[PDB]
């Protein structure tokens, strides 16, 4: 049934189609726009950009993410920080391994015609928070290893790129 695919589409919490919903709700003119090569900048994402953004996103680093993140996604990140400020607790987490770092989609959207690159990856990390003064764990485990999933909407300037939309999720992969 077509209804089952439709239900699965707008009900799944995989970062990639979460992102895909808010771009839509062909790829030929996208790759010619930037000129650089897809394959040459795929490993350049995996080399520097992705690890540098992830460890920043995990530790709670705002000054670096303010650069990469656009006006709206950074706002929704800073708003997530309020609660941690309110609970008087700080982010103490790190990223162990980042495997799965490739460019899936390439599309342009409704407001004007901004070209966009969609980057998906899986990461391995622990997520814990310590009390601002006692340095004691408030929430989160080290013993527990977390398998996260990511979807980044990239754009270019006509340091380097900008994140148009970002989402942390959970990978079904055990490693």
**Which residues of the shown chain bind Cl ion in the complex (CB under 5 A)?**
12, 14, 171-173
> Which residue in the set 46, 64, 103, 169 belongs to the binding site for its own copies (CB under 8 A)?
169
The answer to whether residue 5 forms part of the interface with its own copies (CB under 8 A) is yes
Instruction: Choose the contact partner of 144 out of its own copies, Cl ion, none; CB within 5 to 8 A by kind.
Output: its own copies
CB 144 within 8 A of CB 126: yes
Instruction: Choose the contact partner of 79 out of its own copies, Cl ion, none; CB within 5 to 8 A by kind.
Output: none
The answer to whether residue 6 forms part of the interface with its own copies (CB under 8 A) is yes
CA 86 to mean position of chain CA atoms: 24
Angstrom CA distances, 37 to 2, 44, 135, 160, stand at 37, 10, 46, 14
Give least dist CB 170 to Cl ion, A: 8
Instruction: Choose the contact partner of 143 out of its own copies, Cl ion, none; CB within 5 to 8 A by kind.
Output: its own copies
> Which residue in the set 83, 110, 158, 174 belongs to the binding site for its own copies (CB under 8 A)?
174
> Which residue in the set 19, 20, 45, 117 belongs to the binding site for its own copies (CB under 8 A)?
20
Q: In this structure, are strands 89-108 and 115-131 parallel, antiparallel, or unpaired? A: antiparallel
Instruction: Choose the contact partner of 20 out of its own copies, Cl ion, none; CB within 5 to 8 A by kind.
Output: its own copies
Q: Of the candidates 63, 64, 40, 39, which has an alpha carbon nearest to the alpha carbon of residue 51?
A: 64
The answer to whether residue 1 forms part of the interface with its own copies (CB under 8 A) is yes
Distance CA 11, CA 27 (A): 26
One-character DSSP codes across 5-65: HHHHHTT---HHHHHHHHHH---HHHHTT----HHHHHHHIIIIIHHHHHHHHHHT-HHHH
Give least dist CB 93 to Cl ion, A: 20
Q: Provide the binding-site residues for its own copies, judged by CB under 8 A.
A: 1, 4-6, 8-9, 12-14, 17, 20, 24, 127, 141, 143-146, 149, 169-174
């Amino acid at each position: 049934i077509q209804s089952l695919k439709n239900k699965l589409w707008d009900e799944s919490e995989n970062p990639l189609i979460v992102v895909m919903r808010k771009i839509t709700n062909e790829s030929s003119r996208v790759y010619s726009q930037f000129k650089f090569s897809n394959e040459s900048f795929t490993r350049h994402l995996r080399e520097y950009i992705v690890p540098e953004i992830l460890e920043a996103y995990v530790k709670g680093d705002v000054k670096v993410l303010k650069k990469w993140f656009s006006e709206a996604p950074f706002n929704v990140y800073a708003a997530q920080q309020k609660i941690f400020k309110e609970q008087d607790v700080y982010a103490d987490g790190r990223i162990l391994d980042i495997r799965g770092v490739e460019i899936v989609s390439a599309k342009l959207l409704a407001p004007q015609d901004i070209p966009v690159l969609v980057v998906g990856c899986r990461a391995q990390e622990i997520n814990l928070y310590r009390k601002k003064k006692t340095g004691e764990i408030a929430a989160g485990d080290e013993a527990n290893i977390l398998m996260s999933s990511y979807a980044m909407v990239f754009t270019r300037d006509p340091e380097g790129w900008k994140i148009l939309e970002f989402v942390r999720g959970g990978s079904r992969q055990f490693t």
